[PDB]
Design a protein around this ligand. Structure first.
Ligand SMILES: CC(C)Cn1c(=O)n(C)c(=O)c2nc[nH]c21
Ligand SMILES: [Mg+2]
Ligand SMILES: [Zn+2]
Length: 326
């Protein structure tokens, strides 16, 4: 008949495989069903004997541990996971990666921003927060996201790894930790350099090579909003700036340094994305494209289009402010 929302329709399940998926259409419950379907569809439930009910309880617990920040929230984690899911199909990753690696990629993507406070590492460090003190200024947020991820998995009713032998667990844990920590943008240049260094003669059978490729994959997915259709990507920019301005505001009231790229007075939607697309997104997907050429047309294309559109927006934004400032 006319089924309920949480029962995904065959059209949605089909659409869920492409980077064009409208992530804004669904409520959390529907997004949880989407994540659940990903695990079954990728054959992870099957190959890792994941209790299908535990899979649901786990996702629900994961959701409960994401905060309602304007950007680093559950919907962001759904975006990262859904783009990873898309890349698996787009790049035929199951031909290159083992099911354990797929499991690592997906679980890390879902768990990568757990219990994010809404203020980055620079804020944690400068304000000497409890997190910065706990982690000695070393990627405190990522270390925390990772720790929460395993405290959750430590709860029996949420342990989707309960049927994986201990050696498998250790391997997965290590892999997840590496990937989540790799999402700290402060290490972006470092990670990109190491990847390109191995990209000179890439070897899919080289464990070090694959680890770096997985780090790049989760990084690509994490900052992949702009790869999505303009109408889906744009509203994310306002969410990010909302979070950024909240921090710079607070940093001014407490006397802590402020990052220009978070300055309510020097940043616009356009200036924020132009540079990020040109010097972070495009270069990275460009190197990834060497390994998977199909990535150019499906993701580099929209990035080029976004870059051009934001440059146009900037021109009129600049023109508009040339009528202001008495
Ligand atoms: C998280 C943030 C520091 C990096 N970051 C991001 O993840 N996305 C998606 C952007 O669009 C963006 N624009 C500037 N920085 C960005
Ligand atoms: Mg993060
Ligand atoms: Zn993230």
């Amino acid at each position: 008949p006319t089924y309920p929302k949480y029962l995904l329709s065959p059209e949605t399940i089909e659409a869920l495989r492409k980077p064009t998926f409208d992530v804004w259409l669904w409520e959390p419950n529907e997004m949880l069903s989407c994540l659940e379907h990903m695990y079954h569809d990728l054959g992870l439930v099957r190959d890792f004997s994941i209790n299908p009910v535990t899979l649901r309880r786990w996702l629900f617990c994961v959701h409960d541990n994401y905060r309602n920040n304007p950007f680093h929230n559950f919907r962001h984690c759904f975006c990262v996971a859904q783009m990873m899911y898309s890349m698996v199909w787009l790049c035929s990753l199951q031909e290159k990666f083992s099911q354990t690696d797929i499991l690592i990629l997906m679980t890390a993507a879902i768990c990568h921003d757990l219990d994010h406070p809404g203020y980055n590492n620079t804020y944690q460090i400068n304000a000497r927060t409890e997190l910065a003190v706990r982690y000695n200024d070393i990627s405190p947020l990522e270390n925390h996201h990772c720790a929460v991820a395993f405290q959750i998995l430590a709860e029996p009713e949420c342990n989707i790894f309960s049927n994986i032998p201990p050696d498998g667990f250790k391997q997965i844990r290590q892999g997840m930790i590496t990937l989540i920590l790799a999402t700290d943008m402060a290490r972006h240049a470092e990670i990109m350099d190491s990847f390109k260094e191995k990209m000179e003669n890439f070897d899919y059978s080289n464990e070090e090579h694959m680890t770096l490729l997985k780090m790049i994959l989760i990084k690509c997915c994490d900052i992949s909003n702009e790869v999505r259709p303009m109408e889906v990507a744009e509203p994310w920019v306002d969410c990010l700036l909302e979070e950024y301005f909240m921090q710079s505001d607070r940093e001014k009231s407490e006397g802590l340094p402020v990052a220009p790229f978070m300055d309510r007075d020097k940043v616009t939607k356009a200036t924020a994305q132009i540079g990020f697309i040109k010097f972070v997104l495009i270069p990275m997907f460009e190197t990834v494209t060497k390994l998977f050429p199909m990535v150019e047309e499906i993701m580099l294309q929209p990035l080029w289009e976004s870059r051009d559109r934001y440059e146009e927006l900037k021109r009129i934004d600049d023109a508009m402010k040339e009528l202001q400032k008495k």
